[PDB]
Amino acid sequence: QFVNKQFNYKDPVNGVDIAYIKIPNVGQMQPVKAFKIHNKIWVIPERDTFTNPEEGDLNPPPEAKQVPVSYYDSTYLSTDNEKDNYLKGVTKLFERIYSTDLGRMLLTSIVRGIPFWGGSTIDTELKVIDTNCINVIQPDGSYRSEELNLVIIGPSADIIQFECKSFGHEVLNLTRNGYGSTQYIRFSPDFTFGFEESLEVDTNPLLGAGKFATDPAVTLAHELIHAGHRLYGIAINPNRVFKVNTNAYYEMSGLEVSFEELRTFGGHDAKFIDSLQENEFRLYYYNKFKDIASTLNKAKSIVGTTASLQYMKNVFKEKYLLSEDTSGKFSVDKLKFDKLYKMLTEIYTEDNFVKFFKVLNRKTYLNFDKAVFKINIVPKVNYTIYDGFNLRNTNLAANFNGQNTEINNMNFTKLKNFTGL
Ligand SMILES: [Hg+2]
Q1: CATH code of the domain in which 56 resides
Q2: Of these residues, 55, 223, 260, 350, which one is catalytic?
Q3: Domains held by the chain: number
Q4: What is the Cα–Cα distance from 207 to 350, expressed in whole angstroms?
Q5: Which long-range contacts (CB under 8 A, 24 or more apart) does 133-136 make?
Q6: Is 226 annotated as a binding residue?
Q7: Collapsing DSSP states into helix, strand and coil, what is residue 9?
Q8: Ion ligand 1 neighbours, Cβ < 5 Å
Q9: How far apart (Å, rounded) are the C-alpha atoms in residues 190 and 76?
Q10: Which parts of the sequence bind Zn(2+)?
């Protein structure tokens, strides 16, 4: 079991795993109630009005601009009951991901993926990077800094814009230099997307109303895979995009999909990135792990009193699977690097999780969303850790009937259609 406490949103704060916290954003903010569901992983059941100064409220953009696939509701996730349900929904989804061998591996890699202590401007000293921590209000009212890897937070204005956010460094590209950084995942367990079972229908923008619902566990896993990349500093620059020439409608609109998203989906999508660049990326991040080992070897003392130099050097030797001689000098073994790189990029994919969940799912990232549904996964009669919607020993166990929004219509309320627009 991944989440040892069944938190209720109204549980009293203790300054340990139920606390009012502040996020290291450049602006001001009122403390927000947060829940530590696992070592290094916190959940904030609030709409993310914090990580991005440009998204400080919940109203859509009124400047003759509006993205087609979007959904707005400024009251969602504003009541204590919604926040309680959000917390239990997210918890349930982590347990579902933890219930599979692949999910356990991913969550283990994510917990191990401590953002690198590269904040020191002096080579002989190892120092944390402040924006990889939160500030936790203690029972005496004072703040203490706590390192963390992952935050699950509510979506911003656009409810169905699920994405990873993280704080940048002035000089460093933390998500693409091997360092990594604390990841804020905007996510909701209260909505899901509809897709079409037929491939030609799913990839056509004019057809389908979204007969089947995506298992939210897959959506979170997709998100967590992205966070794994960025926590290990191997995320592919989103400016590297594949000019889709395999879907006449994508080409018609000149749609480009980032290599990072094709990689995350896996399956055939990941094959659109040809060998020459794949090799280039691998070699690029292999060197970054070399510079990390070269930084560790120069560090002779540590900054602060939270942990010893020896301990932090070992934390990063285990994160990056470095090699260590008797004198403590670290190096990167190409074999072990390729092992970890492939693990994070090819083993952890959305298409692989589909196999472990035994759910129905979009066959490619290169499709067209059909509709968005309101769901409630907290009741065991709706959704279980082990089966998602396809509850065993009911009519929903077979043929993914649980995700069939026409057969299981009581579990889905269609809110918006995207076909045609
Ligand atoms: Hg993400």
Answers
A1: 3.90.1240.10
A2: 223
A3: 1
A4: 24
A5: 133/24, 133/182, 134/21, 134/22, 134/23, 134/24, 134/34, 134/42, 135/21, 135/22, 135/24, 136/15, 136/19, 136/20, 136/21
A6: yes
A7: coil
A8: 164, 223, 226
A9: 9
A10: 222, 226, 261
